[PDB]
Design a protein around this nucleic acid. Structure first.
Ligand SMILES: [K+]
Ligand SMILES: [K+]
Ligand SMILES: [K+]
Ligand SMILES: [Mg+2]
Ligand SMILES: [Mg+2]
Ligand SMILES: [Mg+2]
Ligand SMILES: [Mg+2]
Ligand SMILES: [Mg+2]
Ligand SMILES: [Mg+2]
Ligand SMILES: [Mg+2]
Ligand SMILES: [Mg+2]
Ligand SMILES: [Mg+2]
Ligand SMILES: [Mg+2]
Ligand SMILES: [Mg+2]
Ligand SMILES: [Mg+2]
Ligand SMILES: [Mg+2]
Ligand code: NA
Ligand code: NA
Ligand code: NA
Ligand code: NA
Lengths: 88, 41, 203, 144, 213, 208
RNA sequence: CCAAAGAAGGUGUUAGCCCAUUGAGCCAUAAACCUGAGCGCCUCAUGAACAAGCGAGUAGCACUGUUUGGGAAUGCAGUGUCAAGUUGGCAGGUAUUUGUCUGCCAAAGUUAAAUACAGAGUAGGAAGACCGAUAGCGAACAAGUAGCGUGAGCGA
RNA sequence: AGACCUGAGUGUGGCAGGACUACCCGCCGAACUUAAGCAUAUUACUCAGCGGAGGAAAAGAAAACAACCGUGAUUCUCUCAGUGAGCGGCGAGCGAAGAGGGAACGAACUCGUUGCCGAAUCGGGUCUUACAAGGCCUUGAGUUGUGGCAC
């Protein structure tokens, strides 16, 4: 399955020629997380984010999430989660 | 002990007790009624 | 099982219900002693993850430690020597507070073996850690292949030597490879093998 | 050994070659490389030009194994051929095979006149080496 | 590392009419106020104290030591150099001296003695026997009480057959496959008297090679 | 005077030397021959204790991992589960039978896997499995004559059964083919290197 | 004259043969150790054959302090702030936002050997191109003694 | 009445404090010194100080390397390497890692979780020649979960 190597030291598939071998969801946990989240309600951070998203400040919400969480990927995922939550 | 000693030469129907077993009974929808104590600490 | 619900609930410490529970608990712990013996752990899921078992010979204590940075204990806040060492209020203790709580528990009750500890609460002034300890003389402990390793005397006061999880944490032993080469198997061990002069016989 | 040193020759000279006026004092120039810009500047400048300052790009976490690239020239290729094989070699005939990387070489460079025509297996070859060995009846075969 | 320095020993200064050397503190003792720490002071520390990481051992190129062993063997093939070294070989039949391999079957020291007399090696053994004496000087206090000359050295093809020669005083034994330069040139002097058995002698060509092989 | 010397960096500034005030920080090797003799005596004692089992367990052949060392071979840690299963062996059983087992090695290609499978087969065919009970022999085990014959593999690397690691064979002499006598190897090599080297810049230019 | 023993100690001068020393070998053994995982009886255990998940005030992030060769931050600490869930995390030595690839799966735990013994101890051993009574440990001797100091200590 | 659950008293059975501390583990932590001055730096993550264990300790079964034709817990040795790495009033100085040859190596296991069970568990009395990894009994502990089995 992997592309065989060309046999030379440089180039796109460089390397010594061998015949290569190929490299060898959480629904119940999601159910538990959903029950617990419904049980406890929103963290005050989630409340601030939901207030930001209600009044149309998506950028401010993203910046607040980035500041509190410290990571941009986590901030984006949190903003999306709050958007999906407000859609219910 | 008496029942097992007799069988050598399952258990009768009873309530489910214990947090692990009761939780499993609820999750599998095997419980018809669940009684919970209000003062667990 | 029920463990999943308890674990998820304890991942939500900033919710209103967990904040209420923790507020009540922190007030009560405020009005208790620095070291308190508990019949049962406050967080059974966490305690069992850390090796606690509901057996004879297993004990749980709640240990309180004070928050803040370390004050350097010099007379009148006066230091001597190079200005580099002149700080009094801004230095930080190189151990973490969990290791300190374990050490206080272990020093106080020398007949027990400290196994592990976990966070349970914190105030603005205080932090509470529940320490798990084992009685090495209990027959239940001595005849258990899962825990009777701690009976052997090399594990006496292992918390005093930084050998528990918190001690390993502040020793840097959570890391391996290129993020930990200068601290393995210890800082002193690496310094010893990096700084001793080798005299080969034929050189 | 102690008996051959100037100390034995100096027994009874009192000053041991250091003088009456300037003594043998402890550190009259400072310790080690002190004052390379102040009072040792002429020594540093005339014998070690370039010693002070900065130059070029940094390379953090330098690994020398990915950079391993030893070289051998065309007129040295006979070091890597068995003694009987170099004779049965000729242009147009059956030629010995040299595999460079197993001999500890990565690149065929190509200085001089090649002595024994051969087939050379190299990871790298310079353009002049390749052309020169083809003119002599050999060849280069790339390898990795 | 602590010898000569196990004292408080501070200098008194120049106020008093004494030398500036450090002096032992305290009172009520014959060493109170005595000079201390100095290489010139009684009870003081030696100048440049000896260390264990002095270079005790030497590395010698493998080819040079093989060359040295070869030169020593060629020197032993020369009767004039052998007598110049001090051996008594005026009665031996041939040099290099090669004997039959059957001496490896000896079991009693008496037979080995008879064999040494037979091939006239007994004169050199007797020179060694008579040279025995107490060592001169401090070396006898150390575990080196007696000295003697070296005497003949009998080379065997292997590790067997040395039972009857071990107790012979003044006879050294050697194994042809592990020949030692310290025994072939004692004191750095070439010309050791070597008795070869036949089997060890025929092995020298494959052990050391030829000028072409 | 200083004169023309190398600029010294001897790095002896720290309290390494033992003296009246310093413990020092030194490591001498004076016990080297005694420790060599002890190690050899210990190996002989352990071989005596575990006779007739070989002193060293069976280990696979692996490829050294850089561009500087990938032409070389050496002994690896343990056989992979894929090599063992292909050889018809259970890893727990192989662990009890004298074979090192490594569950981390991943078997990226066929050549290495096959060479190690052959090592396992060669070992298994020469293995003499003593019985738990001499009076009731089971399949695959040894008999009285074989158990009595024995012999202990006392190799340094424990490969007297499978032999030393095997390298690829040196190529035999041949002729220069017409393609080899016409083509510029330099241009081909250079073009491939340039295709990798300028890939991003060629993409950003062609996409503009 | 002995030597499978010449190997050094003792004995009124320098000893293979005056004495001791050792070789084969003999006797006795709480337990522990080694031995078809030594060998039986009882007892007890035991082998063979008839779908979901994976460690939370944790990891990160900010500031401060410290440590590191680790350099837009190698580890750690205080405080604030605090996740994700394998459509996932961590690492991949120039910060960021993207999207590919590779390795691995932290935040419980146990573990022999190879290594240390840089002023330790117990029971035995082996040595030295070392020192030779102002030397060598302070101490070859009723030496950590006699003596000194309120004392910590000093110390022949 | 009584219960549990929080906490006391006494009886019974046991353990800790002290010593050692060369090496080892955790903290704490200088200055002389070097920079020909000196403050960053250096000495040094050293001495002194406070704790803790052993016959070794510590480490240790990959959130490891690499970028290869790939390696494969830990520790240690040579080497990498006084380094065309890096850190540094870029001064004085400082300063490793992977790969490679080797020592060692029967080296691997446990819990928690998940899911299938659910007291099968522990302690205590007392029988077996037996404070049995055994039988019998036992509310004492344990269902706020001990113990079994499986990838
Ligand atoms: K004298
Ligand atoms: K000065
Ligand atoms: K290796
Ligand atoms: Mg001068
Ligand atoms: Mg003296
Ligand atoms: Mg240094
Ligand atoms: Mg002193
Ligand atoms: Mg945190
Ligand atoms: Mg441990
Ligand atoms: Mg005297
Ligand atoms: Mg004296
Ligand atoms: Mg200083
Ligand atoms: Mg000094
Ligand atoms: Mg000054
Ligand atoms: Mg100290
Ligand atoms: Mg250990
Ligand atoms: Na004598
Ligand atoms: Na922190
Ligand atoms: Na104590
Ligand atoms: Na101890």
């Amino acid at each position: 399955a992997p592309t065989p190597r060309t046999g030379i030291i440089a180039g796109f598939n460089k390397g010594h020629v061998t015949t290569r071998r190929p490299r060898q969801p959480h629904k119940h946990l999601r159910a538990v997380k959903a029950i617990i989240a419904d049980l406890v309600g929103l963290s005050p951070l989630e409340k601030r984010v939901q207030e930001f998203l209600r009044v149309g400040k998506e950028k401010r919400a993203l910046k607040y999430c980035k500041k509190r969480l410290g990571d941009f990927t986590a901030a984006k995922k949190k903003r999306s989660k709050m958007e999906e939550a407000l859609r219910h | 002990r008496e029942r097992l000693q007799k069988v050598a030469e399952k258990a009768p129907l009873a309530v489910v007790t214990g947090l692990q077993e009761v939780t499993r009974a609820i999750e599998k929808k095997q419980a018809r009624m669940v009684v919970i104590a209000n003062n667990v600490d | 099982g029920a463990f999943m619900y308890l674990n998820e609930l304890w991942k939500k410490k900033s919710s209103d219900v967990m904040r209420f529970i923790q507020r009540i608990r922190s007030w009560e712990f405020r009005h208790q002693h620095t070291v308190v013996r508990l019949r049962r752990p406050t967080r059974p899921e966490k305690a069992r993850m850390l090796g606690y078992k509901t057996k004879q010979g297993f004990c749980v204590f709640r240990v309180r430690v004070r928050r803040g940075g370390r004050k350097r204990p010099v007379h009148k806040g006066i230091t001597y020597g190079k200005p580099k060492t002149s700080g009094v209020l801004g230095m930080k203790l190189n151990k973490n507070n969990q290791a300190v709580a374990e050490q206080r528990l272990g020093k106080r009750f020398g007949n027990l073996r400290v196994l592990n500890s976990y966070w349970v609460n914190m105030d603005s002034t205080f932090k509470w850690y529940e320490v798990i300890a084992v009685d090495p003389m209990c027959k239940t402990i001595r005849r258990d292949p899962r825990i009777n390793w701690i009976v052997n005397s090399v594990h006496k006061h292992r918390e005093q030597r930084g050998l528990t999880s918190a001690g390993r944490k502040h020793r840097g032993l959570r890391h391996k490879g290129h993020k930990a080469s200068k601290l393995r198997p210890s800082y002193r061990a690496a310094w010893r093998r990096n700084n001793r002069i080798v005299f080969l016989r034929k050189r | 050994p102690t008996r051959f040193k100037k100390c034995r020759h100096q027994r009874g000279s009192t000053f041991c070659g250091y003088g009456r006026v300037g003594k043998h004092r402890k550190h009259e120039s400072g310790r080690g490389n002190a004052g390379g810009m102040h009072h040792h500047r002429i020594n540093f400048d005339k014998y070690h030009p370039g010693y002070f300052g900065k130059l070029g790009m940094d390379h953090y976490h330098r690994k020398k194994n990915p950079m391993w690239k030893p070289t051998i020239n065309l007129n040295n290729l006979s070091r890597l051929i068995a003694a009987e094989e170099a004779a049965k070699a000729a242009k147009g005939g059956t030629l010995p095979v040299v595999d460079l990387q197993s001999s500890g070489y990565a690149k065929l460079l190509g200085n001089g006149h090649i002595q024994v025509p051969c087939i050379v297996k190299a990871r790298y070859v310079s353009k002049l080496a390749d052309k020169k060995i083809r003119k002599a009846g050999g060849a280069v075969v790339l390898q990795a | 590392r602590l010898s000569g320095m196990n004292h408080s020993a501070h200098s008194w200064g120049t106020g008093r009419a004494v030398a500036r050397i450090p002096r032992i503190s305290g009172g009520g003792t014959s060493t109170s106020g005595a000079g201390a720490f100095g290489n010139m002071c009684r009870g003081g520390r030696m100048f440049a104290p000896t260390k264990i990481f002095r270079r005790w051992h030497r590395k010698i190129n493998l080819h040079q030591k093989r060359f040295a062993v070869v030169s020593a063997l060629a020197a032993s093939s020369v009767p004039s150099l052998v007598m110049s070294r001090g051996h008594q070989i005026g009665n031996v039949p041939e040099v290099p001296l090669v004997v039959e391999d059957s001496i490896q079957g000896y079991e009693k020291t008496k037979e080995a003695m008879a064999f040494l007399k037979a091939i006239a090696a007994i004169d050199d053994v007797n020179r060694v026997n008579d040279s025995r004496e107490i060592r001169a000087g401090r070396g006898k206090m150390r575990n080196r009480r007696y000295v003697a000359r070296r005497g003949p050295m009998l080379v065997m093809p292997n590790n067997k057959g040395t039972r009857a020669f071990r107790n012979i005083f003044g006879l050294d034994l050697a194994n042809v496959s592990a020949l030692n330069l310290l025994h072939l040139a004692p004191g750095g002097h070439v010309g050791r008297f070597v008795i070869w058995t036949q089997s060890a002698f025929e092995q020298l060509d494959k052990i050391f090679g030829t000028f072409t092989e | 005077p200083k004169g023309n010397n190398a600029i010294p960096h001897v790095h002896q500034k720290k309290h390494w030397n033992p003296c009246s005030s310093q413990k020092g920080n030194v490591k001498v090797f004076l016990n080297q021959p005694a420790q060599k003799h002890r190690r050899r005596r210990l190996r002989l004692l352990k071989a005596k204790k575990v006779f007739p089992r070989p002193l060293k367990a069976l280990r696979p052949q692996v490829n050294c991992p850089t561009v500087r060392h990938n032409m070389k071979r050496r002994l690896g840690r343990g056989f992979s589960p894929a090599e063992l299963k292909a050889a018809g062996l259970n890893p727990q059983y192989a662990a009890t039978i004298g074979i090192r087992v490594d569950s981390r090695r991943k078997n990226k290609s066929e050549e290495g896997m096959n060479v190690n499978v052959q090592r396992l087969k060669t070992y298994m065919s020469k293995l003499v499995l003593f019985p738990m009970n001499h009076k009731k022999v089971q399949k695959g085990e040894a008999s009285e004559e074989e158990v009595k014959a024995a012999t202990q593999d006392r190799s340094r690397f424990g490969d007297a059964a499978v032999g030393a690691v095997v390298y690829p064979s040196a190529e035999a002499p041949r002729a220069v083919s017409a393609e080899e006598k016409s083509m510029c190897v330099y241009a081909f090599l250079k073009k491939n290197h340039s295709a990798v080297r300028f890939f991003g810049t060629r993409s950003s230019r062609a996409a503009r």
